[PDB]
């Protein structure tokens with residue numbers, strides 16, 4: 001939940017989109033990169049450059065931002081981009 005990104009080398013959106021150059025999975029690569037994720041090159045495993053949170057086993061029609069907020073609500077990239085209200089809404093039911 002720190003304000004300092006875990007992986008500065010992947011802070012650049014262009015650095016992240018590059019990792020998806022040959023992405024074959026259903027979840028949209030631009031949406032993934034915009035949501036802070038880069039591909040690890042091992043199945044559909046991705047990692048956020050900021051919070052360091054990893055996610056795998058993406059399902060059809062899943063939204064990168066929603067999943068990001070669900071699993072890593074303390075991510076400060078998410079807070080900076082989407083804002084707290086977005087995070088609040090994802091966690092509304094619990």
Ligand SMILES: CN[C@@H](C)C(=O)N[C@H](C(=O)N1CC[C@H](C)[C@H]1C(=O)Nc1ccccc1-c1ncccn1)C1CCCCC1
Nearest residue numbers: 045053054055056057058059060062064067068070071072
């Ligand atoms: C359906 N949408 C996807 C994006 C999603 O929610 N992925 C989750 C995920 O990647 N998680 C959950 C938190 C965890 C830090 C991360 C993860 O890396 N999980 C694992 C990765 C490799 C090996 C095991 C796990 C794992 N182990 C125990 C419980 C959950 N995941 C998780 C994958 C396994 C089945 C439950 C869901």
Ligand SMILES: [Zn+2]
Nearest residue numbers: 048050051075
């Ligand atoms: Zn994050």
